[PDB]
RNA sequence: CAGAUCUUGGUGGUAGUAGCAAAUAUUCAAACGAGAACUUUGAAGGCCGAAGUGGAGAAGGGUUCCAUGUGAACAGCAGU
RNA sequence: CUGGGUCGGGGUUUCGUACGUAGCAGAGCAGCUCCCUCGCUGCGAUCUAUUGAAAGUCAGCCCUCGACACAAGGGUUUGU
């Protein structure tokens, strides 16, 4: 299935580039029928997707 | 393969007489063969048969 | 006898070789090896111990600007003896000579290849050390 | 045949091997290979090099 | 039997000698699949993603000379396939590679 | 190998040869040690003993 | 009508040939699916390296925007 | 003729002495002393010992008889 739509919405809601969005890989079914920002905003709070942290860039 | 050798030489008159020389050689390993068959040839005006 | 077993020719026409005697020259400019018949489009090459015509390009004004026969003493190209040791000196070298085969100067600095000392006995008389 | 010790190492040079280089002040030296060739021609001190015979004899290594 | 599982030490420096630089790691994979298919004989080989990290770890221009591989054949244990058998390759990290044999292991 | 047709009579082909040194150092690199028994004597003991 | 380097339409040999080589690079697993070198997710390795392979505009395009679906045709292989 | 295949082992060979630890080594500086004083603790490029060590070694090198499994099969034909 095309999880692209869910990825773009998960970037706008989280306010981060879609590199960082992490759609869960084992649960591609429940995301597939969540295609409105009234559910993806819900779908985050249950942890089924999250925002990946920035890759480290150490000045040490 | 190939390998060196060192020998004297006794060519009379050469500027190399009675001195060492090194000379690249081969090594052709030759186990003894085994005879199994005989063939006879007859001369024909056409050729050998 | 007259053996001169092939030694790797390493100074083609154009080689500038340090003069090695007291005639006052400092550079021999080879123009043509002596004794080479050659092939279409091949520069003659002068080995060690080969008479070779040469025009001094830097030294006594008497010597410069004329063609003098020369002999190559030390060559930089590693040449083989006939016993498997590849002797090669530190620089090109030479010495002015008459076409009768005898030196013009009387003091050679540096070593001399054993190939020369066997060929031109006049050079082998003045050689400091036949290396 | 005569064996000639290297001038940058101690390894024996058998008659077929090596190459010989004679500077323009009257000294011939034997070299076993090209590794010992361009070490001397760069003047690297033959006793600061961890594999020569001279170095192994200087620190008395093995003795 | 037909569920036999055993270690191996795949030498991927002699299956790679003589290849270009951008096609070195991707060639290491096929030389692993040409290993399972020759050893076990089954035509389904499923390289575990932990291995794909372990063969790309250095880069693509350089791959570890020896990689230690556990060839666990299976009988469609947790799947169902048209082929009855398929070997699931796996990674067995080790700090040394001296005096290691191809020993068998408990199933 | 085949015995020769061209009869040889020159000096160079009627030579009697007695060798002096059949070189046997390794060809798999610039060899420097004729025999193993010689190699271990110049090196000595190792950490692999 | 045999022709005019004739007009229009059509078909060959060439030919399954030239070719699909400008800018470093892809791999492993999983999903729907009839089908997967290419689609989507995840893991890894790379690049564009802020005078950008980034974020917005003016000319110009005019519905390409967004969603659901399709496997005629086009996307010089393929394609969910 | 048991066969070769893989891993390991040694021989060769390439480069030059690994990580780790210890040193009353180490040009100096800093902190603390019953101020003893080459006293004690620290940073310190490097050198020394363990160390011809470490690593690669056929993919077109050699020998093994050590571990492992595999090995006589499958498809297309041909008649005086």
From Swiss-Prot, chain A:
Citrullinated by PADI4. The keyword Phosphoprotein applies. Coiled coil: none annotated. The keyword Ribonucleoprotein applies. Signal peptide: none annotated. It comes from the Eukaryota. One of its GO terms (cellular component) is cytosolic large ribosomal subunit. The modification Citrulline is found at residues 4, 15, 37. Keywords: Citrullination, Cytoplasm, Isopeptide bond, Phosphoprotein, Ribonucleoprotein, Ribosomal protein, Ubl conjugation. It is found in: Cytoplasm. GO terms for molecular function: RNA binding; structural constituent of ribosome. Disulfide bonds: none annotated. The modification Phosphoserine is found at residue 12. GO terms for biological process: cytoplasmic translation. Belongs to the eukaryotic ribosomal protein eL19 family. Component of the large ribosomal subunit. The ribosome is a large ribonucleoprotein complex responsible for the synthesis of proteins in the cell. Component of the large ribosomal subunit. This is Large ribosomal subunit protein eL19. It comes from Bos taurus (Bovine). The gene is RPL19.
Swiss-Prot record, chain B:
It is not required for incorporation of RPL3 into ribosomes. Signal peptide: none annotated. It is found in: Nucleus, Nucleolus; Cytoplasm. Component of the large ribosomal subunit. Interacts with DHX33. Belongs to the universal ribosomal protein uL3 family. Component of the large ribosomal subunit. The ribosome is a large ribonucleoprotein complex responsible for the synthesis of proteins in the cell. This is Large ribosomal subunit protein uL3. It comes from Oryctolagus cuniculus.
Swiss-Prot record, chain C:
The modification Phosphotyrosine is found at residue 29. It comes from the Eukaryota. GO terms for cellular component: cytosolic large ribosomal subunit. Keywords: Cytoplasm, Phosphoprotein, Ribonucleoprotein, Ribosomal protein. It is found in: Cytoplasm. InterPro entries: Ribosomal_uL14, Ribosomal_uL14_CS, Ribosomal_uL14_sf. GO terms for biological process: translation. NCBIfam families: PRK08571.1. Belongs to the universal ribosomal protein uL14 family. Component of the large ribosomal subunit. This is Large ribosomal subunit protein uL14. It comes from Oryctolagus cuniculus (Rabbit).
Curated annotation (Swiss-Prot), chain D:
The modification N6-acetyllysine is found at residue 27. It comes from the Eukaryota. There is a cross-link at residues 2, 27, 35 (Glycyl lysine isopeptide (Lys-Gly) (interchain with G-Cter in SUMO2)). Mono-ADP-ribosylation at Glu-4 by PARP16 inhibits polysome assembly and mRNA loading, thereby inhibiting protein translation. It is found in: Cytoplasm. Disulfide bonds: none annotated. The modification ADP-ribosyl glutamic acid is found at residue 4. Component of the large ribosomal subunit. Belongs to the eukaryotic ribosomal protein eL24 family. Component of the large ribosomal subunit. The ribosome is a large ribonucleoprotein complex responsible for the synthesis of proteins in the cell. This is Large ribosomal subunit protein eL24. It comes from Oryctolagus cuniculus (Rabbit). The lineage of its organism: Eukaryota, Metazoa, Chordata, Craniata, Vertebrata.
């Amino acid at each position: 299935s095309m999880l692209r739509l869910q990825k773009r919405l998960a970037s706008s809601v989280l306010r981060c580039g879609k590199k960082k969005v992490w759609l869960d890989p084992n649960e591609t079914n429940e995301i597939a029928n969540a295609n409105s920002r009234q559910q993806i905003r819900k779908l985050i709070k249950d942890g089924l997707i999250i925002r990946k942290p920035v890759t480290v860039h150490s000045r040490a | 393969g190939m390998t060196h050798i060192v020998r004297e030489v006794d060519r009379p008159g050469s500027k190399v007489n009675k001195k060492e020389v090194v000379e690249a050689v081969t090594i052709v390993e030759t186990p003894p063969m085994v005879v199994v068959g005989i063939v006879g040839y007859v001369e024909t005006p056409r050729g050998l048969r | 006898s007259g053996a001169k077993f092939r030694i790797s020719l390493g100074l083609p026409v154009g080689a500038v070789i340090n003069c090695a005697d007291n005639t006052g020259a400092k550079n021999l400019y080879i123009i043509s090896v002596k004794g080479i018949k050659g092939r279409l489009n091949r520069l003659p090459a002068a080995g060690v111990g080969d008479m070779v015509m040469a025009t001094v390009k830097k030294g006594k004004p008497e010597l410069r600007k004329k063609v003098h026969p020369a002999v190559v003493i030390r060559q930089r190209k590693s040449y083989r003896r006939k016993d498997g040791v590849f002797l090669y000196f530190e620089d090109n070298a030479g010495v002015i000579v008459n076409n009768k085969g005898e030196m013009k100067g009387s003091a050679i600095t540096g070593p001399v290849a054993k190939e020369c000392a066997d060929l031109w006995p006049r050079i082998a008389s003045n050689a400091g050390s036949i290396a | 045949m005569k064996v000639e010790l290297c001038s940058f190492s101690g390894y024996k040079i058998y008659p077929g091997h090596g190459r010989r280089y004679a500077r323009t002040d009257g000294k011939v030296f034997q070299f076993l290979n090209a590794k010992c060739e361009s070490a001397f021609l760069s003047k690297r001190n033959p006793r600061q090099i961890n594999w020569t015979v001279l170095y192994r004899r200087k620190h008395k290594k093995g003795q | 039997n037909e569920v036999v599982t055993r270690e191996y030490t795949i030498n991927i420096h002699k299956r790679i000698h003589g290849v270009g630089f951008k096609k070195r790691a991707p060639r290491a994979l096929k030389e692993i699949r040409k290993f399972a298919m020759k050893e076990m004989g089954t035509p389904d080989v499923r390289i575990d993603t932990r291995l794909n990290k372990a063969v790309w770890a250095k880069g693509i221009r350089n791959v570890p000379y020896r990689i230690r591989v556990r060839l666990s054949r299976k009988r469609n244990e947790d799947e169902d396939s048209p082929n009855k058998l398929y070997t699931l390759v796996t990674y067995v990290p080790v700090t040394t590679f001296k005096n290691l044999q191809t020993v068998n292991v408990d199933e | 190998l085949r015995k020769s047709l061209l009869v040889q009579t020159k000096r160079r082909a009627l030579e009697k040869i007695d060798l002096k040194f059949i070189d046997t150092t390794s060809k798999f690199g610039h060899g420097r040690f004729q025999t193993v028994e010689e190699k271990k004597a110049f090196m000595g003991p190792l950490k692999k003993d």
